[PDB]
Amino acid sequence: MANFFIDRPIFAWVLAILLCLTGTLAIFSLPVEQYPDLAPPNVRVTANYPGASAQTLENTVTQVIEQNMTGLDNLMYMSSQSSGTGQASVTLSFKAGTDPDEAVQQVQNQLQSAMRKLPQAVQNQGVTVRKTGDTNILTIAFVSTDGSMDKQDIADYVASNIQDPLSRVNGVGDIDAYGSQYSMRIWLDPAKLNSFQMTAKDVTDAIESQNAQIAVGQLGGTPSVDKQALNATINAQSLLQTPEQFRDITLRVNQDGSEVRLGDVATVEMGAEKYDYLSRFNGKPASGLGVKLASGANEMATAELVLNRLDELAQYFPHGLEYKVAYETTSFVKASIEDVVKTLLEAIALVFLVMYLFLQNFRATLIPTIAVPVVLMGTFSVLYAFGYSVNTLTMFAMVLAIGLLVDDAIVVVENVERIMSEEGLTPREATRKSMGQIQGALVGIAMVLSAVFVPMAFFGGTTGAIYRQFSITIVAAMVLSVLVAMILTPALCATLLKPLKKGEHHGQKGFFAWFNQMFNRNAERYEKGVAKILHRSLRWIVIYVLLLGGMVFLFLRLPTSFLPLEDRGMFTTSVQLPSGSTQQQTLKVVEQIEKYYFTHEKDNIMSVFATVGSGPGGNGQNVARMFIRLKDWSERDSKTGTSFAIIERATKAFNQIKEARVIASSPPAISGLGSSAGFDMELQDHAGAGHDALMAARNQLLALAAENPELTRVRHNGLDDSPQLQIDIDQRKAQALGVAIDDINDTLQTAWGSSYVNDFMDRGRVKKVYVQAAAPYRMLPDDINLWYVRNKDGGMVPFSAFATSRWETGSPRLERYNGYSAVEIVGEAAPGVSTGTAMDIMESLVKQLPNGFGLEWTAMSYQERLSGAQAPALYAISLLVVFLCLAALYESWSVPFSVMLVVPLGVIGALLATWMRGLENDVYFQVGLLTVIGLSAKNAILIVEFANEMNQKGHDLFEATLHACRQRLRPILMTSLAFIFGVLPMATSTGAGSGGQHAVGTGVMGGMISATILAIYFVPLFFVLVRRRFPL
Template identity: 55%
Template sequence: MLSRYFIDRPIFAWVIAIGIMLAGIGAMLSLPIAQYPDIAPPGVGISATYPGASAETVETSVTQVIEQQLTGIDGLMYFSSSSSATGQSRITVTFQKGTDPDTAQVQVQNKVQQALSRLPSAVQQQGLSVTKQQTDFLMLVGLYDETDTATQADIADYLVNNFQDPIARIDGIGATQIFGSQYAMRIWLDPYKLAAVKLMPSDVQSAISAQNVEVSAGQIGADPAPVGQQINATVTARARLQTPDQFRKIIVKTQTDGSIVHLSDVARVELGNESYTTSARLNGHPASGIALQLAPGADALKTAEMVKAKVAELSSNLPHGYKVVYPRDTTPFIKLSVEEVIQTLLEAVALVVVVMFIFLQSWRATLVPAVAVPVVLLGTFGVLALFGYSINTLTLFGMVLSIGLLVDDAIVVVENVERIMEEEGLSPRDATIKSMEEIGSALVGIALVLSAVLLPMAFFGGSTGVIYRQFSITIVSSMLLSVVVALILSPALCATLLKGSDEEKRHKGWAGKFNRWFERMTDGYVRRTGKVMHRRKLFWGLYVVVLALLVLLFVRLPSSFLPVEDQGQVMVQVTLPAGAKSSRTSAAIDQVQNYFLNDEKDNVAFAFIMTGFSFQGQGENVGQGFINLAPWDDRKGIVNTAGSIAGRATKQLAAIRDAKVLAMTPPAIRGLGQSNGFTFELLNSGGLSRDRFLELRNQLIAAASKDPMLAGVRAATLEDTPQLKVNVDAEKLAVLGLTQANVDDVLSSAWGSTYVNDFVDRGRVKRVYMQADAPYRALPTDLDNWMVRSSSTGEMVPFSAFATTQWTMGPSTVSRFNGLSSFEIQGQAGDGASSGDAMDRMVELQKQLPAGTSYAWSGLSYQEQISGGQAPLLYALSVLVVFLCLAALYESWSIPLAVLFVIPLGLIGAVVAVWGRGLENNIFFQVGLLTTMGLAAKNAILIVEFAEMAHKQGKNALEAALEAAKLRFRPILMTSLAFIAGVIPLATATGAGAQSRVAIGTAVVGGMTTATLLAIFYVPLFFLTIARLFGSDKPHGAPPATTPDAGVPA
């Protein structure tokens, strides 16, 4: 026997235990720390720019061309795209979890290369980027001037020049986005001056390209050289221009009279912004920021630490008044939530030790299971390292749940040894040997059953499978290590630490009072168990009622993917009417900033706001705010949580005229959406016109806005905006000797923004842009100021001679999903409803629309949909594997039923507890259910194992069941109370990340409570019923007997 070997060699047992702990310590010090494992599926982003193009032009000329090539890519889950009126095309390709991000990027890059030749030349000139990325921001590095002397453009240029590239090169950063822009050389054209010298924008562009170049002039005396050559030197000639004065002197034309036309004669030249789309402020000061996206698979905490170290290094020489802040930083919440779980873990250990001491009443006996805690926990860290996992809230949750489990095995060992010592008067060594012969198989059986319950989780795929695996591997490895300790170290400790039973001590003081009370309770328990088996039909009927109640409550539980956490951040989205200028947006978002800095000043650390950007899209009529809240300890009470603050802000800021303001909290899992709530994709699967498709979208949003199960339902893209359409008469072009190419060139150069080439500014290469000066592109009539040169006459022809204009409405952003035109709709569950209820309701409303549309889910909602379908299969698979393990253990198809019947008795407690606290059926609840299933089965096994042994020794089924119930009553209560005590800190958690702890803790505490209180009565009944049903009630070699306690004939 394995235990006997180590009973005789206790030092060897200690060596093994110490080796496990040392391996665990080494692993613990090297494991990365994260809030969650890498749950979000990997993504690859494609970005392209078509300057001056409308959203529809970008969609048809760029986005669709690229999308058509996205076929035959391994692991592709879905892709989405947006084409904006700012000329931006962004495609996000999302892959199945487990896909190698590097391989995915290479495959996408190859597909983009196939489409490159079909893209407009302006797009190719700007360049395309293909990057590994996630869809949200890890953090936002902000820079502001507290003296208010610098402009937003000055700060943005400094940030780009000095911060962006060093930060972008940090390992773990997938992509960066600057809120603002660096300087650029701006050539502002004057149409009247151009016409006076018969020039078009293309002539100016050609002149700049020809004269702003670097010449490779070669060398003097380079080989092969004449014999005797004595000198070798590099020849330098023209270099790129560097200052506005140098650009002003560019010669754009030489007149017939010999006079020279310089660039300054037809344009205004200045050092301006590369882009004027966004501006930012922090607490009222001019600011700029760099948003950082985490690369797939990167360690968030480690990457953030490297970013902050690099920023600290770069900040050593900041200009006077410049300050660095982090308006959005997810890492404090990650650190604090992990610290809270670690504190819960320590509290659980302390409570478990206290419970063990109360029952064992001896520090020597308590030391045996207490020693198992560090050995198993540290050993579990070693297993996590082998699987490449991290220290995160999920693995730590698994360890908290494991504490009660891992001491169970050692408690069973020491309790049984003490019982044998007391009843049979054996020495500690002999009692330990006999005890291990009795319970060794039960310990293995418990380990098999718990592993069978939890191990199937490890084989589920997708992001949900990642969460399940963290729990599965952690708890199963803890259980297996616990059994190893219980079979190797615990017997050795019992044989060497325990002393003979001290009857006098057991009957004195608090221990004596406790033991006398517990003996009376045990006698009462046995009598009541006898009555239960005497009234078998009644209690089987009650069991059926419990099953019905379980089903009824379970189907009525609201569902969600993950609980909503207070992450210390609030995001604000501001939208003004289509066509609104940035000045109006700036005025509105200033009111948003003032609200948070004044009305919520006790809850807000600082507010970073910007115009021209939002998660809806880019445009002058949108804005976005990142509100960094005060520390959690300074925001006590539910009214000061992030969710409450966001809710109040949305209501109060609704009073801002002409602005729609929505405050929201970040998503539960970084990388799965931009905010909490659902993400619904309405697809144009019927080839509807855009106007009809838009009409149906508005119809759906209107219906959803009236539904009490839904809240905050909104379009995730910007509304259509006024557009000025230029209609060119092709026949007039031909008559006037004009070409369509020249007309298009004048339009795009004047009203758009043409990238010419590069220049050097303080040692850094920057861009040169050419565009009409602001007064000549302010009104529709300004189009007539622009002229095109006739190729036949050489005269300048105004646009009024061949073109007309008209106002239309067009999209500012065109979205697509999986190759179909789409509208993304976001929202949250209404009061009293769950995210699952909200998702179901959205599907119902979509099905009520006329034909031509379909739907899909993305982001967190996509994962929630998958997880909802996996849960029933997971439960069924776990029960099946448990049954097969028990059948193999007992060599019986019937006895395992006595164990399986107890599982609903645990589930009812979990469901009632969660329902009673108003919680939801989410992944943490599902893990809690599976844990409860294993624990309920464990208690049943302790009784069934001893009942089966007694039955084989000659007792009938009734006697065997009652004897087993009496013998195992104390260890079952002790192990169950120890486990419940260990999990109570989860169920009562507060602070960062509390909702997740509460979700799993409530389910397990409720489930374990009923699994203990009901199972101790029902397991003997199940054993007796199965024995009689399958004809194994007769004793082996003994006549029928009567049990006086129960008053029931055998």
């Protein structure tokens, strides 16, 4: 194989060009992402029980649904919520890698099973099963520049002309509206309704009958008369347009001639919702749109399309209206990807320079360099074939790969150079002999550098996915490198390399002359030291045992985490006032926060978009969210302008604020995983105690978390108990009175809440018609008697006769986790403290709580615990696979055992580097540690394979190992330095996703430094000792 392509260089060039072209096509056709899915698919089951208390809804529906749902295929954990508004939502998160469609089908089947057991009212209302994609790809704010357009006018225009076309953009799962369009809202006064003896049902029926559009046939139908002239459709009536027409709805004509008009019994207005989002942008009234990314769609492409369409729509906005991008994700993705590309190019440059240092010949430097584009584009082709994408994980794997993939090319080139320099052979003969000598070594290096990343691919969860991303890329790169090393590089060495003895490089003074002198002297000293330590075995065995102990100590000492946080240029601050607070107080607090951000962080804030209130769909107005967008990373400082510094500085001031609970939190590392950054904990009530007991436990936990300085921004992701109405309707009492269940239910919906009726055409656009009770009347325990519902006989049975309403203090929103009343508690670790330490502290605090209150981590916390628990297995499996592969290659057990003893020499260096830098044991460290294992095995192989060959030929073990070290010192050094300077830009990256780059690069760089400076001495010791113990 190697000899075949030596004499046919053009064939090798053609193969390389084919790989390059396929890779270029793949690159131009590969999708761009920040991360892959990496998120457990979630399916949400939603049910509605109108006019039902939260506890009653939870008991009658939520629990039942959960019971049937339990026992699914890959159900990781069930989380459920029961709201006072009457909506029950049970969320089912499935194990990562589960196809969402199959999960949805299973949930639908079990919902079919459970639907009968549910209350018939809920069944009539309808139960919905859908895969929930809640990733907010971008949030858009529409603000009137001139001020001519009112906030309600802005909301109406947006919901009429912008929301509808944007919803039709590809990949837009759901576009939330932070403002509501106008609607023909009709406010019923029960006083007038009882005055004229008309129930709300009569009003609804009159609106339905009078405001309608029905086709009744055709003028001039097909069996027409002999000579008709016109064929036209006939419509029964028209849809009302102005509010005045609604006021003229008849509803009755008395015998005297008087008519009880709708305006006589109610008031109609083309207004907006009673409690609409009081959205603001940079201290100005504005409306908003929240675009959510549909499941299984590319965020960047969808955002570009939406932005694109919005740009088009903008061209047709009324004078003085413009759109602002309050929240954007693709900016960070583009910045991070471009930064990683710059890092990769800098890595290629540094690898070229370090190779040129050892190989002064320019062509000899080019020959391994050419392997980089070929293997890189082949890896891109492999990624395209397997359906992977260009994300941060794959790009990090590529940058890691560079130094590994250049290894075999470097080995071949320098072996050819050594043969040319010493034996004096021609480049062709030198290449032949070099391939014959080191054919085994290349295969061994590829095996050790690829076997480490195989087992990782067989794990599951988000962790397994991350591992797989690295595996595929790195395994493909290693396979191509070993293919390139035996196809392209031998031909290049046989052709590109000039004899180089005519040029007389020896005697050429300069920097390279001094470098060669230093290298030769140090190599001689190194061989002397290797001989000495071979003689003095016991001392270095003791040193090795001490290194093992230090490695264990650093392993236990190192804090753990899942994924480094990144400066995305955004963070969200949440405002929660004490329960019962009006929207105006929340607005005042929001104004205070905006003033703080404008007057303190004036050099970093680009725009703040606040959203006061829960909106029309919700219960309390004491909630506000504030989307904060920072300036570009270049504009902001690298020390005080970072997102983390801004968040901490704001957190101090906001913790000073006592008016309301205000927390500034960075966005989560993974969009679909968790709501915000930091740990995510569910405080389950295992004892089954009361809800108030759970609330007291929650308060104790929050107080303790506030006490500990290791924890910051600890908050309850929920709502506090507040007085709530509970309309209780006795079905048997109503049926004794003969009043229909449907009629009383509709009347209850109309009075307590709002009832949609039909549509009316406004300016050519259809808009909804809502029938609602008057402002003072909200089906209070007092006014329930004022409402009347006629029975079958027609007599106006009073509502109070069959229904009872009473104020009750309880939680508006009840939550459950895995069959246990629980409250979700979220928080973040203090600066300098890892997430794992924060989780340990939270576990200690929950232990400090009274009995019966266990905890269960969810989302990113759950998967971080999974990765931490599963990490030792991988290491063990990867080491075992490397050992078995090495035993298979050399058909011996002494050689692989000698190699595996060098693995601790790299792990100690990686641990030292991460510990000194201040990083933590995350997933990246794990994959890094795996890379360090592979490279330590690489150096060990580079020595022991030649030593074993020499021994098998019959040379003395001492002489054989000394000769092997002397010859292979330069290959080990230059390959390792190539890798070190390849990963150096990662460890010193600035801006964009610099945190991930640092986390990946630091550990591997330290591992390489230790691996060289320890292996070059210990590998001879291991090989000699093992061979003495087990002779040939």
